[PDB]
mmCIF file of C-alpha atoms in Angstrom:
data_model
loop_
_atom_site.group_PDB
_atom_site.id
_atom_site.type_symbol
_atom_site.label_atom_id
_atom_site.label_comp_id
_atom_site.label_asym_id
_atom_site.label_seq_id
_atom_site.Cartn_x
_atom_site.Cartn_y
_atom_site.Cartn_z
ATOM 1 C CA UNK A 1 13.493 2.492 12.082
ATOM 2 C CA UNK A 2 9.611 3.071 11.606
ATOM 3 C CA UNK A 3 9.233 4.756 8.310
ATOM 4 C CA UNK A 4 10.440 1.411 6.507
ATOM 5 C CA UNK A 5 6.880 -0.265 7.519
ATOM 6 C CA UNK A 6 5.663 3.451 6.576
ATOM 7 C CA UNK A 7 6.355 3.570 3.129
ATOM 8 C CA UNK A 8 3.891 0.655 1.369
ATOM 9 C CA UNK A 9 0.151 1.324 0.185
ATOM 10 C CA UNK A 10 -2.319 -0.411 1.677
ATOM 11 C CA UNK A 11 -3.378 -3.560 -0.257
ATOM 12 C CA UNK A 12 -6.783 -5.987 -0.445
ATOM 13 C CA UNK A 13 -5.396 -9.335 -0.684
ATOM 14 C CA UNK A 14 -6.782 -11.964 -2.331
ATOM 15 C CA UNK A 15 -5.981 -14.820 0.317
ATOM 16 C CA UNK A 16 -7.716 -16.167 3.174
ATOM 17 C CA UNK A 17 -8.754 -13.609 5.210
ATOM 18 C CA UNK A 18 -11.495 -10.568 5.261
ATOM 19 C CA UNK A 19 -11.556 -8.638 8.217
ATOM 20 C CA UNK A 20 -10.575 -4.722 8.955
ATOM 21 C CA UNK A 21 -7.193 -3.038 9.796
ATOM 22 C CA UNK A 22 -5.392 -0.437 9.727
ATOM 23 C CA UNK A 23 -2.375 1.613 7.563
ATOM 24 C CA UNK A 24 -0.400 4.755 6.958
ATOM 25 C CA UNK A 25 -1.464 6.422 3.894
ATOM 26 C CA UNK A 26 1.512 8.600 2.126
ATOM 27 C CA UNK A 27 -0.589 10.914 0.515
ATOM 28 C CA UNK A 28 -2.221 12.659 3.432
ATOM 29 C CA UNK A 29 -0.037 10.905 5.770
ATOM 30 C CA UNK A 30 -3.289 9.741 8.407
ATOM 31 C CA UNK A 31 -3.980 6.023 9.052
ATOM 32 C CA UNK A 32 -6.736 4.741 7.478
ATOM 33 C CA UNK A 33 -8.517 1.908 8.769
ATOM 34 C CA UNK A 34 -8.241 -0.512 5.393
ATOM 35 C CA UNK A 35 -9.416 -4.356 5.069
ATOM 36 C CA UNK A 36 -6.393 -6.955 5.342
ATOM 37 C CA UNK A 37 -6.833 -10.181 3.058
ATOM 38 C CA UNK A 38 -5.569 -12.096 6.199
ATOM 39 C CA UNK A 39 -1.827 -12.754 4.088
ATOM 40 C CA UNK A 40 0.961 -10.685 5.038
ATOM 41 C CA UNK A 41 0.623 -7.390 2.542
ATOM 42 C CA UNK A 42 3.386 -5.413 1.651
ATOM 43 C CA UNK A 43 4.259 -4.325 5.613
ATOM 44 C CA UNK A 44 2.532 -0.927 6.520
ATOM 45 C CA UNK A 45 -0.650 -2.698 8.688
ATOM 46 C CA UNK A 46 -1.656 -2.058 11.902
ATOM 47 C CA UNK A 47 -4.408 -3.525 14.359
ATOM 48 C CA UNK A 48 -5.460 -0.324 15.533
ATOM 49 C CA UNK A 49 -5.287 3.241 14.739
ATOM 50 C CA UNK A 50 -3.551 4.841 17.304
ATOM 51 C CA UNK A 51 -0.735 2.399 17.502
ATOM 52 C CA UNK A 52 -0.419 3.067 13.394
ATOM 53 C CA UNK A 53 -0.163 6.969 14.606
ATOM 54 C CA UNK A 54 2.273 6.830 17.371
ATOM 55 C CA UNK A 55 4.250 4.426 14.903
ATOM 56 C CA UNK A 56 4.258 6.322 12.122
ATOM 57 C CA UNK A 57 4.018 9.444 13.413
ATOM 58 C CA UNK A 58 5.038 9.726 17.061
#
């Protein structure tokens, strides 16, 4: 199953870690490349783009 990961928001984070990611957005349903706090979120991240697309999507 895919659309498990696919189903949280994107979060911040307030741990330690600062650097950019990726996600699948619900909404419009398009990954949008988000910033990770480092600590594992909720589950919907990706480290790049396409992978979140043929994830998600494909």
């Amino acid at each position: 199953i895919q659309g498990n990961i696919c189903s949280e928001p994107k979060k911040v984070g307030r741990c330690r870690g600062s650097f950019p990611r990726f996600y699948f957005d619900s909404e419009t349903g398009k990954c949008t490349p988000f910033i990770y706090g480092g600590c594992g979120g909720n589950g919907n991240n990706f480290e790049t783009l396409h992978a979140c697309r043929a994830i998600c999507r494909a």
